[PDB]
C-alpha cells in the first residue's frame, strides 16, 4: 500500500514526532516526492551573479535531470534540459561563457542560446523534418530574491507564489545581495534523505553538543524560530568568536525555504552562505554549500573563514545526517522520533521540524 | 511464488544435493532467512574477554543492525541497538571503554550504561515527554561456552536451548577458553551467501587440492564429522608441520554451530580460532576470523602462525567461496550439486553439508 | 505492461525514429533481450587464431555467463560454461594453454578437454553417483568467417543461417583473415545500453564533428551503407592521413552483424579491427576492441596506429555513447530521436540505424 500520512501530521508542534521511518528510506516515497514535489516546485540553483552576463551559463543536476541555465545573447535568462533533441547527447558541461551557438558534440546540430535549432546538417534532405519541433526543450526559470529558480512544471506560476514574503524578508536581512559574489563552493553527495538534511537545519538543539566554535559566536540564548508560508526564519544575536566568526550588534539569519534551500546571513550581515539540496534518491542528496562575499579579492579572514566552514563546521553537520540515515533503518529505532518542542519556543526548541514535516505531509494524502 | 523446500530435504545424506541455486542468490530468500533465522536465533559476536570489565563495550553489525554490547558499571552485560531514541543518531563506535554515561553526539542526550535515559536537555519543558519510553532499546545477550551471543527475539530462551550440549562438548575440546585473549582479527566483507560459507566449512573434501600446509598437519586420514543438535564436530589427528602448525598426540577440533559460527581448537588445543558469519544480503557476508591465544605477549611462532592464517590459509577459503558464488548463477550450473557422502563417512565425506542444509530447509516450508 | 513495439517499427527508414527511450534503460526489456536474443543468437567471441592449436583456450563473459572455449587435445573446438558440475567453482581463468586435463581448484575433480569427467576423487564410494551426468556442461561453438561464435541455444542451426552471405562478403573485403593475429585488445565496461552502441556504429553522420583524424583518411563523400540479412556494410574510399591511417586506392569496410559484433577492414585491407559487444545489463555493455595484424612483430606504424586507436579514436566513441545513455533518461529528451535518413542515402544518412532497430523490434511483439 502507498504510505500516506494524516493531514494533521505535525500540525501541533507541542506534541509531534518526525515521520515514520519509511519516509526517509522508501524508494516508493522518493519517487512520489520527486514527482509531486521537486518536478512541480521552484528549485533554487544559483546566485544571480553566476548568470548576470550574456552567454553566462551553469549546469545543475537535480532528481536525475541535467539542467542548463543560460543568459541569452539578448540578456534573457533561460533554462533547458541539457540533452540534444536528436540523439540525446548532452550539450554543455560545467559553467562558463557559452559560445554564440550551442554545438552538440555528437552530430554538430547547432542551437541559438535561446534553444532554437539553428543548423542541423543535412536536415533539408530528411523527409518531413520538423525544425521547430527539434529545438532544445526548455523549463521555467525565475530570478527572485537575487537568486535563480527553475521549475519543471510548465504551468508553474512564480516563486513568490511558493514563498510569499520571502524576498521581502530576505532583503531586510541582507541589503547587499545583488553585490554578492560566489567565494567558494563545497560539493558533497550526502548519504541522507533530503528531509533528514532539512531536519538538521530546522533546529538549534544540537548547537552546543555538536558545534563548539559556532555556538560560541551565535548565542542561542537569544534565538527565535519564526514560521511563515513555506519558509521559516531563525535569528539570533552574536559576538566576535575566535572559533568561528571574529569581529555593532552582530546578528544571525537562517531562512529555510520550501522545499530544501537555506539562506544564511551570518554575523556582520555583509555576506551569505546558501545550502542547496538536490535530491538524487531516497538515501542520497547532492548538496551545494556556497559562501558568497561582495568582494572578489578575498581577505585572509574570509579565506580562513572559508576553510573553517569546509574543514570544521560543515563536516560536523555532514557526519550528523549520515549517522542519522544509518540509524533510522535499525529495528531498534522504533518508527518515529520526538520533536523536542517547548512551550516557550526557546532557542533549543525543535518546533521548526514540525512546520516542515506538516508541509511534507500534505504530499502524502 | 515463495521458494519452499521439502521437509525431507537432505534428510538422507547418502543421496543428497545442495539447495537449488535460488537459495544462494535470491533476495526474497535472504529476507526470509534474515527474519525467520537471524532475527530469532542466538548470534555469537565475541569472546568473553572483550567484555569482561565494567564499561567494556563492542559494536557489531549483522543483517543491517548496528548492535552495542556493553558491560555495565554494575558488571551486568547488556546489549542495545546502537541508535539514539531521539533522532536516530548512532551512539558508540568501535570497541573500548565506555565513559560512565553514553552521550549521543547529536543532541547530547545521556544514557546510563544500562540504557536508561539519564539527562535529555530541555525534557522538562517538552509536553508529555516520556522519559521511560526514551531509553536505549535493548536486545537479549548471553554469555555461553565462554563466548557472547545476542538475540533480537525478545521471547528467545537461552543459547543452550539452541545448541544443546555444545558448551559441554567445547569445554572438553578446550579447557583454557576463559583464559583466551583476542590475538588478531581479520575482517572481510565476502561476496558469497552465508550458506555457501557454511558449505565450505562443513567438508574436508577440498583439503588436499586447496590447502597444502594445513592438510600436511591435520591428517584427514583419521578424521570424523559427527552431527549433533544444531551443531557438528570435525576432529582429526595431526603432527608438526612447517607449512601450518609446528610442534603429545596433537588433535584438531572444528565445531560448526547454528546458524553460522564455527569454533576451531587446532593442534595443541591451547588456542582457538573462530569464524563469525554476519550476513549482509543474499550475496554478501561479513566475516570475522579471530585468533585467540591465552598469552597477551605473542611469541613469534604465534605471530608467524597469525600471518600464515592471514596470507596463506584464509585467502584459499576466501577465493573458493567467492568463485562458487559467481559460478552457481550460471545457467550451466544445473540447479543443485551432489554432496559427496560415502557410506563409510570417510574423512573426505561431504555428509556435513546435508545435516546443515536439512536444518536450513525447515525454514522454507 | 510489457513494452512492445509495432512490427513495422523503422520499416520505412525515410520516416523513422529510434526506440522509445524505455528500450535503452528498462531492466525488464534487457531481461527479454538477454533471453530472446543473446541466449538464442550466435555470439562472436574471438578470432580463430586464439584457438588454433590443441589445448588453446579462452574465457569470455556475456549476459552473466562465464564461458570457456577450448581446442581439444584432439583438435576439436568446444565451448563450455566455466563452472564445475560439483559445487559450482569456476574452472579456468584468462586464456592460454590448458593442461591435458581441467582440474577444478576446489575439490580437484578432473575433466578431459572435451568436458567429460575423468576422475572425481571418492566417486566410487558415493551412492548412485552419475559420472556421465557430471561432465562440464557444453554449449554450441562454430568457426565461421575465420572467427568463433558460441550459441547458448542447444537447438541453434549455424552462423550462416543467422548472417546469410556474410562470410562470403567478408572474405571479399579481406583476403588474409586466416593469417590475422591479435595485435592488441582494449577492454572497457561501457555505461551504455548495447543498442546505443550499435546505434553509434551504424552511422557516419558524426564523423566530421567527432573524429578529425579518421574523417580525414576515410572520405565520407564517397561512402555507402548497404543493408543485407542481419548485417550491413559501410564502405568508403580513403587516402593517406597523418591523423589516423598513413600510406593503390585505399578502401574502408565496416560490417555490422547481428546482434552486435562489427568487423572493420580499414584502409589497406591487410588488417582488421573488431568490436565485440557483450551486454551486462540494460545500461552496461562490455566491449572488446581488437586490432589484428598478420605479422606478430609489429612495426612502429602499427604500434603507433594501435595507440592512436586507444588514446585518440576509441575515446571519442566511448565518450559519445556514455553521454547519450545519460541524456536519454532526461524528461527533456522526449521519448525518441529522429533518424536523419536522406532520400539519396548519402554518406551521412542515418538509415543504418533503422534497419538495425527494425530487426530488434521483431523481438518485442
Ligand atoms: C539554521 N541553523 C543555524 C540551525 C543551521 C545553520 O545556519 C547551518 C549553516 O549556517 O550552514
Ligand atoms: C572444519 N574445517 C577443517 C573443514 C575447516 C577449518 O576448520 C577452517 C578453519 O580452521 O578456519
Ligand atoms: C562504421 N563506422 C565507420 C561508422 C564506425 C567505425 O568503423 C568504428 C571503428 O572503425 O572502430
Ligand atoms: S545528438 Fe545532438 S546533434 Fe545528434
Ligand atoms: S539523536 Fe541522540 S540526542 Fe538527538
Ligand atoms: S566444485 Fe569443482 S570439484 Fe568441487
Ligand atoms: Fe548544525
Ligand atoms: Fe578450507
Ligand atoms: Fe565513431
Q: What is the DSSP string of B151-200?
A: ES-TT---HHHHSTTHHHHHHHH-S-GGG-EEEEEEEEEESS-HHHHHHH
Taking the C-alpha atoms of residue C69 and residue C58, their distance in angstroms, rounded to an integer, is 5
Burial class of B282 by CB neighbour count within 10 A (0 to 12, 13 to 18, 19+): buried
Could you tell me how far CA A127 lies from the centroid of its own chain? 45
Query: Considering the domain boundaries, does residue C6 fall inside one?
Result: no
C207 Cα nearest atom in ligand 3? 4
Give the span between the Cα atoms of C91 and C105, in whole angstroms.
7
Written as nine digits, the cell of A75 is: 540578456
How many Å apart are CA C356 and CA C338, to the nearest integer? 14
Whether residue A333 and residue B81 make contact (CB cut-off 8 A), yes or no, is: yes
Nearest to B18 by CA among B332, B329, B338, B328: B338
DSSP state of B36: I
**Cα–Cα distance between A349 and A260 in angstroms, integer?**
20
Distance CA C207, CA C57 (A): 37
Q: What DSSP designation does B117 have?
A: B
Query: Which SS3 state, helix, strand or coil, does residue B84 take?
Result: coil
Q: Check CB contact under 8 Å for A206 and B80.
A: no
The Cα–Cα gap between B92 and A18 comes to 23
Best interface-test mutation with C: which of B333, B334, B346 has the largest number of C CBs within 10 A?
Answer: B333
CB–CB of C64 and B329 under 8 A? yes
Which residue from A87, A34, A262 is spatially nearest to A166, judged by alpha carbons? A262
Claim to verify: residue C68 and residue C198 sit in the same structural domain: no
Cell of C10: 523503422
Cβ proximity of C101 and C86 under 8 Å:
no
Residue nearest to atom 1 of ligand 6 (CA): C87
Residue A103 CB neighbour total at 10 angstroms = 16
Q: How many CB atoms lie within 10 A of CB A215?
A: 18
Query: From the CA of B211, which ligand is nearest?
Result: 8
Q: How far is CA B125 from the centre of its chain?
A: 46
SS3 of chain A: CCCCCCCCCCCCHHHCECCCCHHHHCHHHHHHHHHHHHCCCCEEEEEHHHHCCCCEEEEEEECCEEEEEEECCCCCEEEEECCCCCCCCCCCCCCEECCCEEECCCCCCEEECCCCECCCCCHHHECCCCCHHHCCCEEEEEEECCEEEEECCCCCCCHHHHCCCHHHHHHHHCCCHHHCEEEEEEEEEECCCHHHHHHHHCCCCCHHHHCHHHHHHEEEEEEEEEECCCEEEEEEEECCCCCCCCCCCCEEEEEEECCCEEEEECCCCCEEEEEEEEEEECCEEEEEEEEEECCCCCCHHHHHHHHHHHHHHHHHHHHHHHHHHHHCCCCCCCCCCECCCECCCCCCCCHHHHHHHHHHHCCCC
Residue C71, C-alpha cell as written in the block: 581446442
Nearest to B235 by CA among B344, B347, B342: B347
Say how far apart CA C116 and CA C137 lie, in whole Å.
9
Of residues A328, A340, A349, nearest to B88 (C-beta): A328
- What are the cell numbers at C322? 556514455
Contact by Cβ (8 Å): B81, B139: yes
Contact between residue A250 and residue A238 where contact means Cβ atoms under 8 Å apart: yes
Same domain as C131, residue C240: no
C255 Cβ contact partners less than 8 Å away, ≥ 6 residues apart: C166, C169, C170, C173, C231, C232, C233, C234, C262, C263, C264
Contact C148, C180 (CB under 8 A): no
Distance between CA atoms of C71 and C54, rounded to whole angstroms? Answer: 5
Which of A111, A142, A160 corresponds to the end of one domain? A160
DSSP helix/strand/coil, B305 = helix
Domain boundary among B160, B185, B215: B160
Q: Which helix (H) or strand (E) holds B360?
A: helix B351-361
- Is B135 found in the same domain as B91? yes
Q: Are C232 and C352 in contact (CB under 8 A)?
A: yes
Residue C344 CA to its chain's centroid (Å) = 30
Q: Name which of C205, C330, C331 is nearest A107 (Cβ-Cβ).
A: C205
Q: Could you tell me if C282 and C26 are in contact, meaning their C-beta atoms sit under 8 angstroms apart?
A: yes
Of the candidates B285, B281, B255, B326, the one whose C-alpha atom is nearest the C-alpha of residue B194 is: B285
Task: With respect to residue A114, please indicate whether it lies within any of the assigned structural domains.
Answer: yes
C129 & C213 share domain: no
Whether the CB of C87 sits within 6 Å of ligand 6: yes
Q: Which distant-in-sequence residues (6+ apart) come within 8 Å of A346 by Cβ? A: A223, B122, B125
Q: Where are the beta strands (DSSP E) in chain B?
A: 43-47, 56-62, 65-71, 77-81, 96-97, 101-103, 110-112, 138-144, 147-151, 181-190, 218-227, 231-238, 251-257, 261-265, 271-281, 284-293
DSSP structural state of residue B269: S
Contact C326 A90 (CB under 8 A): yes
In a domain? residue A8 = no
Closest chain B residue to the Cα of C136, Cα to Cα: B332
Q: How far apart are CA B114 and CA B135, in angstroms?
A: 9
Residue A56 near residue A187, CB atoms below 8 Å: no
Q: What angle do CA B294, B296, B297 make, to 5 degrees?
A: 120
Which chain C residues contact residue A140 at CB under 8 A?
Answer: none
Sign of CA dihedral C296, C297, C298, C299: negative
Find the helix packing angle between B351-361 and B194-201, rounded to 10°: 150
b/e burial code for range A168-184 (CB count within 10 A of at least 16 → b)? ebbeebbebbeebebbb
Contact yes or no for A118/A102 (Cβ under 8 A):
no
| Cell, residue C106 | 576446489
CB atoms within 10 A of CB A124: 9
Contact in structure between B107 and B86 (CB atoms under 8 Å): yes
Residues B239 and B117 in one domain: no
Q: Which ligand 3 atom minimizes the distance to the CA of C256?
A: 1
Q: Is A273 in the pocket of ligand 1 (CB under 6 A)?
A: yes
Cis amide leading into A259 (omega within 30): yes
The position carrying cell 552546543 is A208
Instruction: Quote the minimal CA–CA distance from B138 to chain A in Å.
Output: 8
Measured between alpha carbons, how far is A145 from A160 in angstroms, rounded to an integer?
9
Q: Please check whether residue B313 is in contact with residue B61, taking contact to mean a CB–CB distance below 8 angstroms.
A: no
Could you tell me the resolution of this structure in angstroms?
Answer: 1.8
Which residue, among A50, A9, A82, A37, has the nearest Cα to A279 in the 3D structure? A37
Q: Tell me how far apart the alpha carbons of residues C226 and C234 are, in angstroms, rounded to a whole number.
A: 6
Residue nearest to atom 10 of ligand 2 (CA): B264
Print the SS3 string covering chain C. CCCCCCCCCCCCHHHCECCCCHHHHCHHHHHHHHHHHHCCCCEEEEEHHHHCCCCEEEEEEECCEEEEEEECCCCCEEEEECCCCCCCCCCCCCCEECCCEEECCCCCCEEECCCCECCCCCHHHECCCCCHHHCCCEEEEEEECCEEEEECCCCCCCHHHHCCCHHHHHHHHCCCHHHCEEEEEEEEEECCCHHHHHHHHCCCCCHHHHCHHHHHHEEEEEEEEEECCCEEEEEEEECCCCCCCCCCCCEEEEEEECCCEEEEECCCCCEEEEEEEEEEECCEEEEEEEEEECCCCCCHHHHHHHHHHHHHHHHHHHHHHHHHHHHCCCCCCCCCCECCCECCCCCCCCHHHHHHHHHHHCCCC
Is the shortest distance between the CB of A201 and ligand 1 below 6 Å? yes
| Nearest residue of chain C to residue B204 (CA atoms) | C107
Q: Which of A211, A157, A162, A177 is nearest to A348 (CA)?
A: A211
Three-state secondary-structure class, residue B114: coil
Whether B39 contacts B152, CB under 8 Å: yes
Closest ligand 4 atom number to CA of residue A108: 3
Distances (CA, A) of A178 to A162, A293, A349, C24: 21, 11, 33, 44
Enumerate chain B positions whose Cβ falls within 8 A of a Cβ in A. Answer: 39, 64-66, 80-90, 103, 105-108, 120-123, 125-130, 134, 136-137, 139, 152
Backbone interruptions in chain A following residues (C to N > 2.5 Å): 247
CA B86 to chain centre: 31
Find the CATH number of the domain harbouring A187: 3.90.380.10
Return the exposure string of B151-171: e unless at least 16 CB atoms fall within 10 Å of the residue's CB, then b: bbeeebeebeebbeebbebbe
Helix (H, G, I), strand (E, B) or coil at B222: strand
Among the partner residues C14, C210, C327, nearest to A83 by beta-carbon distance: C327
CA distance B218 to B216: 6
- Chain A: closest CA distance from residue C288 (Å): 22
Mapping DSSP to helix (H, G, I), strand (E, B) and coil, where does residue B348 land?
A: coil
**Rounded distance between C-alpha atoms, residue A268 and residue A112, angstroms:** 43
Pairing mode of beta strands A147-151, A138-144: antiparallel
User: Which of C337, B46, B67, B294 is closest to A106 using CA atoms?
Assistant: C337
Strands B251-257 and B261-265, by their bridges, are antiparallel
Shortest-distance Cα residue to atom 1 of ligand 4 = A87
Instruction: Enumerate chain A positions whose Cβ falls within 8 A of a Cβ in C.
Output: 39, 64-66, 80-90, 103, 105-108, 120-123, 125-130, 134, 136-137, 139, 152
- Name which of A256, A252, A287 is nearest A354 in CA terms: A256
Nearest to C89 among B21, B324, B342 (CB): B324
Same domain, C274 and C350: yes
A87 contacts A94 by C-beta, under 8 angstroms: no
Quote the CA–CA distance of A267 and A239 in Å, as a whole number.
8
Same domain, yes or no: A265 and A349 = yes
Q: Which residue has the cell 522454507?
A: B364
Does B332 contact C90 at a Cβ distance shorter than 8 Å? no
Domain check: are B144 and B181 in the same one? Answer: no
CA-based nearest residue in chain B for residue A12: B127
- The phi, psi pair for B156, rounded to 5°, reads -55, 150
Task: Say how many CB pairs under 8 Å bridge A and B.
Answer: 101
φ/ψ of B140, rounded to 5, equals -75, 145
Which CA distances in Å does C129 have to A300, B205, C96, C119?
A: 80, 16, 32, 12
Give all strands of the β-sheet with B65-71 in edge-to-edge order.
B43-47, B147-151, B138-144, B77-81, B65-71, B56-62, B96-97
Is residue B354 assigned to a domain? yes
Neighbour count for residue B130 (Cβ, 10 Å): 12
Judge whether C104 and C113 are in contact, CB under 8 Å.
Answer: no
Q: Which residues contact C117 (CB under 8 A, 6 or more apart)?
A: C85, C109, C110, C111, C131, C132, C134, C135, C136
Please give all residues whose beta carbon lies within 6 A of any atom in ligand 5, as ranges: B 84, 86-89, 104, 106-107, 109
Q: How many domains does chain A have?
A: 2
Residue whose entry in the numeric block shows the C-alpha cell 550450473: B333
Residue C4 covered by a domain: no
B4 burial type by CB count under 10 A (0-12 exposed, 13-18 middle, 19+ buried) = exposed
- Cα separation of A329 and B206, whole Å? 40
Measured between alpha carbons, how far is residue B104 from residues B66, B72, B189, C97 in Å? 15, 17, 28, 61
Judge whether C1 lies within some domain. Answer: no
Q: In chain A, whose CA is at the least distance from the CA of B80?
A: A332
Closest ligand (CA of A253): 1
Biggest distance spanned by C-alpha atoms of chain B = 74
C-alpha cell of residue A359 = 508541509
State the distance from the centre of ligand 7 to the C-alpha of A320, rounded, in angstroms: 8
Q: How far apart are CA C205 and CA A122, in angstroms?
A: 9
Kindly provide the b/e burial profile for residues A137-154, where b requires at least 16 CB atoms within 10 angstroms of the residue's own CB. Answer: bebbbbebbbbbbbbbee
Look up the CATH number of the domain holding residue A57: 2.102.10.10
For residue C319, which residues of chain A lie inside 8 Å, CB to CB?
A: 105
Asked whether residue A6 is assigned to any structural domain, the reply reads no
Give which of B288, B267, B76 is closest to B182, Cα–Cα: B288
Domain span holding position A122: 43-160
Which residue among B15, B205, B333 sits closest to C83, beta carbon to beta carbon?
A: B333
Among B327, B332, B342, select the one facing C89 at the smallest CB separation. B327
Q: Three-state DSSP class for B138? A: strand
Residues C90 and C195 in one domain: no
**Does B259 sit behind a cis peptide bond, omega within 30 degrees of 0 on the bond before it?**
yes
What pairs with residue A96 in β-bridges?
Answer: A57
C76 neighbors C111 (Cβ within 8 angstroms): no
**B176 and B316 assigned to the same domain:** yes
Gap between the Cα atoms of C119 and C101, Å rounded: 10
Q: Is A7 part of a structural domain of the chain?
A: no
| Domain end position, chosen among B139, B160, B181 | B160
For A229, other C-beta atoms within 10 Å of its C-beta total 13
Dihedral of CA C291/C296/C299/C303: which sign?
Answer: positive
The tally of CA atoms less than 13 A away on the side-chain side of residue C91 is 36
In angstroms and rounded to an integer, the radius of gyration of the C-alpha atoms of chain C is: 22
Q: Which three three-digit cell numbers place residue A362?
A: 500534505
Beta-bridged to residue A218, according to DSSP, are A238
Q: How far is CA A34 from CA A159, A280, A282, B123, C329, in A?
A: 18, 9, 9, 36, 15
* Shared-domain flag, residues C186 and C210: yes
Across the interface, whether the CB atoms of A82 and C210 are under 8 A apart is answered no
Burial of B107 (0-12, 13-18, 19+ CB in 10 A): buried
Bridge partners, C59 (sequence order): C68
Q: Cα separation of A87 and A134, whole Å?
A: 11
Binding-site residues, ligand 4, Cβ < 6 A: A 84, 86-89, 104, 106-107, 109
Q: How many residues does chain B have?
A: 365
What is the distance in angstroms between the CA of the first residue and the CA of the last residue of chain A?
Answer: 13
Is there a single domain that holds both residue C148 and residue C280? no
* Cβ pair A264, A276 in contact under 8 A: no
Residue A336 to residues A30, B87, B179, B296, B323, Cα–Cα distance (Å): 18, 8, 44, 45, 42
Cα distances (Å, whole numbers) of residue C82 to B48, C95, C185: 45, 12, 22
Q: Which residue has the cell 521439502?
A: B6
Method: X-ray
The grid coordinates of residue B102 equal: 553514553
**What 3-state class would DSSP assign to B350?**
coil
Q: How far apart are CA B93 and CA B105, in angstroms?
A: 11
Closest CA to A273 of A285, A287, A284: A287
CA distance linking residue C84 with residue C98, whole number of Å? 16
Amino acid at each position: 500500500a502507498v504510505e500516506k500520512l494524516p493531514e494533521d501530521f505535525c500540525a501541533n508542534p507541542d506534541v509531534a514526532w518526525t515521520f515514520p521511518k519509511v519516509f526517509y528510506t522508501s524508494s516508493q516515497v522518493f519517487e512520489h516526492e520527486k514527482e509531486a514535489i521537486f518536478a512541480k516546485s521552484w528549485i533554487c540553483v544559483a546566485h544571480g551573479s553566476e548568470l548576470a552576463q550574456p552567454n553566462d551559463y551553469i549546469t545543475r543536476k537535480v532528481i536525475g535531470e541535467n539542467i542548463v541555465i543560460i543568459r541569452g545573447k539578448d540578456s534573457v535568462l533561460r533554462a533547458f534540459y541539457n540533452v540534444c533533441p536528436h540523439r540525446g547527447h548532452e550539450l554543455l558541461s560545467g559553467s562558463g561563457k557559452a559560445k554564440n551557438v550551442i554545438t552538440c558534440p555528437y552530430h554538430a546540430w547547432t542551437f541559438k542560446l535561446d534553444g532554437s535549432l539553428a543548423l542541423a546538417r543535412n536536415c533539408d534532405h530528411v523527409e518531413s523534418f520538423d525544425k521547430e519541433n527539434s529545438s532544445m526543450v526548455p523549463l521555467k526559470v525565475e530570478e527572485y530574491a537575487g537568486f535563480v529558480f527553475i521549475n519543471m512544471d510548465e504551468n508553474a506560476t512564480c516563486v513568490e507564489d511558493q514563498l510569499p514574503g520571502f524576498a521581502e524578508r530576505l532583503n531586510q536581512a541582507c541589503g547587499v545581495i545583488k553585490d554578492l559574489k560566489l567565494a567558494a563552493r563545497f560539493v558533497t553527495e550526502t548519504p541522507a534523505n533530503w528531509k533528514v538534511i532539512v531536519d538538521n537545519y530546522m533546529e538549534c538543539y544540537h548547537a552546543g553538543p555538536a558545534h563548539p566554535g559556532f555556538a560560541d559566536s551565535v548565542q542561542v540564548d537569544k534565538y527565535w524560530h519564526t514560521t511563515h508560508q513555506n519558509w521559516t526564519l531563525q535569528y539570533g544575536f552574536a559576538r566576535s568568536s575566535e572559533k568561528s566568526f571574529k569581529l555593532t550588534d552582530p546578528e544571525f539569519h537562517g531562512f529555510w525555504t520550501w522545499p530544501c534551500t537555506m539562506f544564511n546571513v551570518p554575523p556582520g550581515s555583509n555576506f551569505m552562505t546558501v545550502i542547496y539540496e538536490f535530491p538524487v534518491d531516497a538515501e542520497t542528496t547532492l548538496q551545494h554549500y556556497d559562501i558568497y562575499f561582495t568582494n572578489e579579492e578575498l581577505t585572509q579572514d574570509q579565506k580562513d573563514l572559508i576553510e573553517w566552514y569546509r574543514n570544521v563546521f560543515r563536516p560536523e553537520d555532514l557526519n550528523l545526517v549520515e549517522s542519522v540515515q544509518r540509524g533510522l533503518k535499525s529495528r531498534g529505532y522504533r518508527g518515529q522520533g520526538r520533536i523536542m518542542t517547548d512551550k516557550q519556543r526557546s532557542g533549543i526548541s525543535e518546533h521548526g521540524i514540525a512546520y516542515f514535516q506538516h508541509l511534507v505531509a500534505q504530499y502524502h494524502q
